[PDB]
DNA sequence: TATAATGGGA
C-alpha cells in the first residue's frame, strides 16, 4: 500500500451568489451554498476521464494525448457524465445540489477568482492523498520498508 | 547408527518455500556480484574476498594479520562501496542455507 | 550444464 500526495490544477465555474469568498482552503469547510441547482458545464470539448475521489470528482477532458481543461467536481456536485463519454462544449457535466464543500481528504490553495456577471471562474491548486495498493509475486522482491517516504520515478519493487 | 543421526540432523532443518528459493537464489547471485565489484574497488581477487567473507561468517577462528587486514581495508570505504560488502556477507549466508535446506 | 524430483533399509 502506497499512500501517494497527488497535486492537481483544476477549473471551477459556481454563481458568484453562493461563493464563501476565500484563498485558501481546508478540508471539509464550504466553497458555496447554492440556492438553487446550478449547472456546471463545460467550457471545452473532449472525452471525459471521471476519477472518482474519496468525496469529490475530477473530469478530465482530453483530445487526442493532451489536455483541454482540468475539472474539479467539489462534494455536493454531482457528475452528469459517465467515465468515456463524448461531451461537447456547452453540454452540462454536474449539478451542483445543495451546498458544495471542499473533500475531507483534500486541501484546496492558490485559488483564482474571474467573475463575468454572477458566474465566477475558479482555478484552485488541490493536494490530496490517493492510496494504491500493489501485488507482488513471488518472483519480486521488495526494496522499501515499512513507512519508507518515497519520491516519484523511484522503484518500490 | 551414523545414517539415523545425519537423517536427523538434515531433518532439523526445514524445507524452504518457492519464495524463500526464490530469495535465497537471488541474494546468492546479488552477493556473488557485489563481490566482483569490490575486486574492481579494491582491486584484489575474487577468491580472496570469497573466502574472507565465508570467515567472518561461519567461524570466528594468518588469521590475526592478513584476514583482518582485509576485512580492515573493506572496512574502511566509502559508504557507496560498502553496501556491496553487506550485501556479499548476507549472500554467503543465503548460499549457507540454500545447501542446508536441500542436503 | 536446467520439466520436477527433498529423511535408509535390513
Known amino acids: 500500500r502506497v499512500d501517494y500526495l497527488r497535486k492537481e490544477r483544476a477549473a471551477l465555474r459556481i454563481p458568484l451568489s453562493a461563493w464563501v469568498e476565500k484563498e485558501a482552503y481546508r478540508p471539509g469547510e464550504v466553497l458555496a451554498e447554492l440556492s438553487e441547482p446550478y449547472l456546471f458545464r463545460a467550457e471545452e470539448s473532449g472525452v471525459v476521464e471521471l476519477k472518482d475521489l474519496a ?91 515499512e513507512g519508507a517516504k518515497v519520491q516519484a520515478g523511484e522503484k518500490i519493487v | 547408527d551414523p545414517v539415523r543421526q545425519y537423517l536427523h540432523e538434515i531433518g532439523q532443518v526445514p524445507l524452504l518455500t518457492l519464495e524463500e528459493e526464490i530469495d535465497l537464489a537471488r541474494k546468492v547471485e546479488e ?16 577468491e580472496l574476498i570469497r573466502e574472507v567473507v565465508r570467515a567472518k561468517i561461519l567461524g570466528t577462528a594468518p588469521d590475526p594479520k592478513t584476514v583482518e587486514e582485509v576485512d580492515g581495508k573493506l572496512k574502511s570505504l566509502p559508504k557507496e562501496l560498502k553496501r556491496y560488502l553487506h550485501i556479499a556477507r548476507e549472500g554467503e549466508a543465503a548460499r549457507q542455507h540454500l545447501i542446508e535446506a536441500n542436503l
Open chain 1, 55 to 145: 468525496e469529490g470528482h475530477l473530469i478530465y477532458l482530453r483530445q487526442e494525448e493532451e489536455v483541454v481543461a482540468r475539472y474539479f467536481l467539489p462534494a455536493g456536485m454531482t457528475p452528469l457524465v459517465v467515465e468515456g463519454e463524448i461531451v461537447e462544449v456547452g453540454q452540462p457535466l454536474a449539478e451542483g445540489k445543495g451546498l458544495l464543500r471542499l473533500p475531507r481528504h483534500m486541501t484546496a490553495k492558490e485559488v483564482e477568482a474571474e467573475e463575468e456577471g454572477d458566474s465566477v471562474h475558479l482555478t484552485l491548486f488541490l493536494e490530496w492523498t490517493e492510496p494504491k495498493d500493489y501485488k507482488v509475486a513471488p518472483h519480486m522482491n521488495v526494496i522499501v520498508p
Open chain 2, 31 to 46: 552477493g556473488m556480484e557485489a563481490i566482483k565489484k569490490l575486486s574492481e574497488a579494491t582491486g584484489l581477487d575474487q
